[PDB]
RNA sequence: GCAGCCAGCUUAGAACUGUCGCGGACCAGGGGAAUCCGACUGUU
RNA sequence: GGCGUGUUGGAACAAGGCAGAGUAAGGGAAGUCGGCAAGUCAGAUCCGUAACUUCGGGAUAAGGAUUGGCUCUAAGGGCU
RNA sequence: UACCGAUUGAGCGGCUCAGUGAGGUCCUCGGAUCGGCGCCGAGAAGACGAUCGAACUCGGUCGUUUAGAGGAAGUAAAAGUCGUAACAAGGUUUCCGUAGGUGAACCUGCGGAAGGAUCAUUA
RNA sequence: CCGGAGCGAAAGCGUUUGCCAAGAACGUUUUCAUUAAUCAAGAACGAAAGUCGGAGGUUCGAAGACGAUCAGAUACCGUCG
RNA sequence: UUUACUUUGAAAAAAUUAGAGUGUUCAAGGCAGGGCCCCCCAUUGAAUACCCCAGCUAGGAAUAAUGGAAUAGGACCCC
RNA sequence: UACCUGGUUGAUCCUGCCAGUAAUAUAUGCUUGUCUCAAAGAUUAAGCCAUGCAAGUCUAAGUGCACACGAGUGAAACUGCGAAUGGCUCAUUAAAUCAGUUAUGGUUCCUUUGAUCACUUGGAUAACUGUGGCAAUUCCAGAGCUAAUACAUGCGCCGCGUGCAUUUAUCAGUGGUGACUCUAGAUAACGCCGAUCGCGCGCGCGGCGACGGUUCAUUCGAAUGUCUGCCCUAUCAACUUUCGAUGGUAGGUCCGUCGCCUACCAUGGUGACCACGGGUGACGGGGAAUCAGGGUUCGAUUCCGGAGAGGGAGCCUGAGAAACGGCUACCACAUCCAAGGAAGGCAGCAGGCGCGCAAAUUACCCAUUUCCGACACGGAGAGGUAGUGACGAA
């Protein structure tokens, strides 16, 4: 499990239950609504703003608690040769544990959160499976 | 980089005072107040350029070390004061009073005497804010404060508050068919008639301006400045309302007056 | 000094980045907290545009809540038992933010026998022998014994609660931070999340 | 799926602590750069 | 288990010896054919180890840090 | 003009291992003192500890700049000696790879190539 | 026989017979259905000489000896190896 | 199913450059002035373009990707 | 203006480079009659500096017994504010600065504007009068007075009340947001309310101003993040963490977010689409030169942003400085000593040495331009003007 007792701050505790907040198009699916984990990084869950930006990318990577490894694809021109080359730019974001089948080739969209690591500005708003079985 | 500064260069002043860059370096930094530094006049720009009543810096300084000029009514001393728009300069001594208002460029013109329409100005409203036991709050468009509210105003209505007692007597709602007389750059002084407003969740909002010649176009949210509602101003308009003659067109009437005078 | 910036560590790939200046006063650091217990010290710390900041050195008393119910009385704060963070911050028994905490369960009696009227944490066996305890245990008028009968029908606090009160060590909870605001205020356990950090004070010793 | 019981001996980490002292006796390689000769171990 | 200190006792504690590989301020091989002599190092743990090489090595290279006592925590099993 | 080169190189310069560490901040304390007036208050010097850390003494590593006995090349001179390697069948066809040998160009073997002096040689 | 003929990615490959598993082209109303082309990094193969370890060493023949020629041959030529 | 691509507008400092306007005696430049005894470039000026790329704003759907149904957890209506 | 010409040869057609040609910018050579503009110690040495100056500031309005002049301007003096701007240089710096973009719902503020908001009790103290120490400094000591805008003093619960700033816990739903754990409400609890001043009337009064506080504003602005974009180098291929490297939990810390730091856990993060490392005669950009187009090269340099003040490091005060024309050390360098000690930072404006191929006057003044303060008055080597000037241009 863990070491601290993992609780919402603004809701109180059963006496004598989840808290979500996303917004812009991305509200709380039903898998996040009852849920049974409880971290402060997760977009419904925990206390993130989606304020600044929003972009895309492939997940690449998911060794890691909580963040996957995304990577935004772009085309640099240049103008003396007039073509373009190909760049990327990748970014370790907040997975929810609510999201499932995102295991690889899988297209996620984010969002500009609080800067909740040394890396991680953005978090994981959509999960789009490929075509697959 | 330490702190505030306190100078500015004449090359980095704005473009709408047109400045002589043949006779100092540094521009007349406004003085700190209600407006941008970057949307309002010097009071010696407009004392000593556009009304050329100062010769120099030191003159301006005999007026308001005199008692003469009064933004809004109250006597400045600052010759550095915003001034910026929709203030209105009324001089008793002189009986003129003027009203900083723009032209179909974006430029401070000199508006001359509207008594019976300078008493009064209209603000731009920025937030709703919640006091205590639940008073809401308006900030205005020249750093006036406005208190008790009605219910019915929200974030982007205009107001009219007179010069003394300073309380809201109309207002005009925003909607699909106002007249406005846009800022924001590249647009300064177009005066036209609100047509559309599209909406983007977490981002500036576009809102398109028709002037009266049809000039549509589009712009940000926060750039409309309603002054009439419907097709009506409020206060007197400068020599050209928002018909922005083009180059040809400004060329054509240049052409046409001096071979008359 | 101390100093909280980025451009001294190591970037995202792992490359070292060279400081494009030197030490700046807005990103400056000081001393951790490290509140004791002890009664009344509480230095004052000049910040950032001119205001006050309350250094906590050490506090005796805090203002603890009950979860279950509605009741926030001052108590005086006895010693830390456990710290999820790390056990060095209840060996040298420093008050932080979300370390439990075995507070004084006094005042919290001292209102319920006036409000509910039903002794909880009285010895199994022995009797009230202070006659101030008595008069809550009196004939009164009746609009007073009137709401007295509908507060006691929900008085069963659980049974893992009702330990403490017999021992008046209640298990708390810091709920602020101490060398920033300047008081240990915050709660009491209460659910699940008493018996969370019961289970770890029980292994820890075990 | 664990509860109960039993069984050692190592390892890591931490606090505290004494005069910064602690492989406290005992036990227990000074090291480096080169030349010559014989390869080495062995033998006399 | 064995024994009276190894073919004798007693009293002194000079020189000079032999041994204790006794210790020695400041200097640190200036001693000497010559660092002869003994001095330094030393165990263990955690780090870090070059020139060169037959790729095996060199290597405990070199160079560092730690080491006590006490009170705890954690992990490493078996059996019904 | 560069290279190699013992020197166990070195004037020369950057980040760092491990030590030592001024100074300040902070903390734990200390209580010289003067305002009350024999207790509450202010309170300097100074000290423990923590922290930031200049700098210094030794090392590791990287970058960079230089000395060097001597050795071995390149180029520019005069083309001096020797022989004729190549350019006509260059008088042993040339040349490549490879190896060995030889004052020197070169010789030879093996396998190539024509950039050969054969685009061809007869049922 | 053996050619301006074939095959292989090239180097390269020709006595008989046998064994072994490949390959182009062509044939196709078969099959698969864009599974591609070219390709830093990486790899197989790669004449001959050479190198290490065995066998066998006919012939040839680096080196080497000697015989001839030349002003001089440490070569071409010759014997031998 | 969403991108790349093109077009429009705000944004994309000033100066400089391009460049409208003005006889600094001309020009480099400057942002200022010809004429009628307190009016007169119609309360003398006055503009604009460009500002790559990326992000942002409103169309098109050609090209090139991508993608919705094959053990149909298929699209629609049911009930 | 979308341009070529000489040179391999006996001669020829080619490949091909050299040379020729024209701007550009540094130096230099010779020459130089006029006018209007105008760069000018950046390049090697962010090497080192003699002297002087560059921030002080007084209104009718916080405090006014120098009799110097005579109530009143008063010099000194205490309080307030500025000195964190400007200027200079380009050493450092290669996703860093910077540019576009934009986030602070992840942050605070002096001045300005607009809000709002216990009859004045207390004791020193400066200038000064007076007594002195040290060779010496913007050194001060002892005593004696005398000021503060310095310093200090219409309900819940249950008889009978009535301003609050913050910190946790709980309940409910005024104005908002694309989205609050927002702003509001309520419950249990836990240093902001003016002891101040001027020109001035009537008969227990009012109407004119300043200064200043409290939380919300505004504005001049700061600070930290999102997206995109940097030259050369693979003879730099793997890199980052036994001291945070990547992520997770809690907490500490700061105005605030965050490995910013601490502790427990995971073995991650980056990388051939060039990480990492190294080099740069690298401050970034706006721009400059040259160009048919495409480009090449340059940008120390007056604007913007950043960086630094010999090298670092650490601080005080303040709203804002890790300030150096402010301090505390060490390092480098250096000055006056009576040898005890004391005092130093021209990559500010002139000037000197040195360095070099290479770059001006110890000049005049706050009038313009403006900036700073108590301000009409005072201050500004910021700036303006002139000298030197064949950078360059008309
Ligand atoms: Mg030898
Ligand atoms: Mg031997
Ligand atoms: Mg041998
Ligand atoms: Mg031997
Ligand atoms: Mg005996
Ligand atoms: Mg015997
Ligand atoms: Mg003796
Ligand atoms: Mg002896
Ligand atoms: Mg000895
Ligand atoms: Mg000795
Ligand atoms: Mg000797
Ligand atoms: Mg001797
Ligand atoms: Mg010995
Ligand atoms: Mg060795």
């Given at each position: 499990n863990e070491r601290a007792y993992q609780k919402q701050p603004t809701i109180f505790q059963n006496k004598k239950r989840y808290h979500r907040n996303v917004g812009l198009g991305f509200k709380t699916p039903r898998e996040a609504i009852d849920g049974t984990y409880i971290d402060k990084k997760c977009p419904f869950t925990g206390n993130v703003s989606i304020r600044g930006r929003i972009l895309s990318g492939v997940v690449t990577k998911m060794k890691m608690q909580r963040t996957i490894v995304i990577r935004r694809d772009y085309l640099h021109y240049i103008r003396k040769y007039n073509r373009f080359e190909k760049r990327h730019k990748n970014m370790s974001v907040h997975l929810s544990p609510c999201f499932r089948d995102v295991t690889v080739g899988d297209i996620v969209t984010v969002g500009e959160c609080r800067p909740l690591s040394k890396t991680v500005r953005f978090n994981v708003l959509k999960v789009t499976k490929a075509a697959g079985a | 980089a330490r702190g505030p500064k306190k100078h500015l260069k004449r090359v980095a002043?704005?473009?709408?005072?047109?400045?002589?860059?043949?006779?100092?370096?540094?521009?007349?930094?406004?003085?700190?107040?209600?407006?941008?530094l970057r949307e309002c006049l010097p009071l010696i720009i407009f004392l000593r350029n556009r009304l050329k009543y100062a010769l120099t810096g030191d003159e301006v300084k005999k007026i308001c070390m005199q008692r003469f000029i009064k933004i809004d009514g109250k006597v400045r001393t600052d010759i550095t004061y915003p001034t910026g728009f929709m203030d209105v300069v009324s001089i008793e001594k002189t009986g003129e009073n003027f009203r900083l208002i723009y032209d179909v460029k974006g430029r401070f013109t000199v508006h001359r005497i509207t008594n019976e329409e300078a008493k009064y100005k209209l603000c731009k409203v920025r937030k709703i804010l919640i006091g205590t036991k639940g008073i809401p709050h308006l900030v205005t468009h020249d750093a006036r404060t406005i208190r008790?509210?009605?219910?019915?105003?929200?974030?982007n209505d205009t107001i009219r508050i007179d010069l003394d007692t300073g309380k809201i007597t109309d207002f005009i709602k925003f909607e699909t068919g106002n007249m406005c007389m846009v800022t924001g750059g590249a647009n300064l002084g177009r005066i036209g008639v609100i047509t559309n407003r599209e909406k983007h969740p977490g981002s500036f909002d576009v809102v398109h301006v028709k002037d009266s010649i049809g000039n549509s176009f589009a712009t940000r949210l926060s750039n409309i400045f309603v002054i009439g509602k419907g097709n009506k101003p409020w206060v007197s308009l400068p020599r050209g309302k928002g018909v922005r003659l083009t180059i040809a067109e400004e060329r054509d009437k240049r052409l046409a007056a001096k071979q008359s005078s | 000094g101390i100093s909280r910036d980025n451009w001294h560590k190591r970037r995202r790939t792992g490359g070292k980045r060279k400081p494009v200046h030197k030490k700046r006063k807005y990103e400056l650091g000081r001393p951790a907290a490290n509140t004791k217990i002890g009664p009344r010290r509480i230095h004052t710390i000049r910040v950032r545009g001119g205001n006050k900041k309350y250094r906590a050195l050490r506090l005796d008393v805090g203002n603890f809540s009950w979860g279950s119910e509605c009741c926030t009385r001052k108590t005086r704060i006895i010693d830390v038992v456990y710290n999820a963070s790390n056990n060095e911050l209840v060996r040298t028994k420093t008050l932080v933010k979300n370390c439990v905490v075995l507070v004084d369960s006094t005042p919290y009696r001292q209102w319920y026998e006036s409000h509910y009227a039903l002794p909880l944490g009285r010895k199994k066996g022995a009797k009230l022998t202070p006659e101030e305890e008595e008069i809550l245990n009196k004939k009164r008028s009746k609009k007073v014994q009137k709401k007295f009968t509908l507060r006691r029908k929900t008085a069963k606090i659980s049974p893992l609660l009702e330990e403490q009160f017999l021992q008046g060590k209640l298990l708390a909870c810091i709920s602020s931070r101490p060398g920033q605001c300047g008081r240990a205020d915050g709660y009491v356990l209460e659910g699940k999340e008493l018996e969370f950090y019961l289970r770890k004070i029980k292994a820890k010793k075990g």
């Open positions: - | 002043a704005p473009k709408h005072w047109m400045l002589d860059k043949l006779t100092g370096v540094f521009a007349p930094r406004p003085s700190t107040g209600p407006h941008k008790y509210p009605d219910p019915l105003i929200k974030v | -």
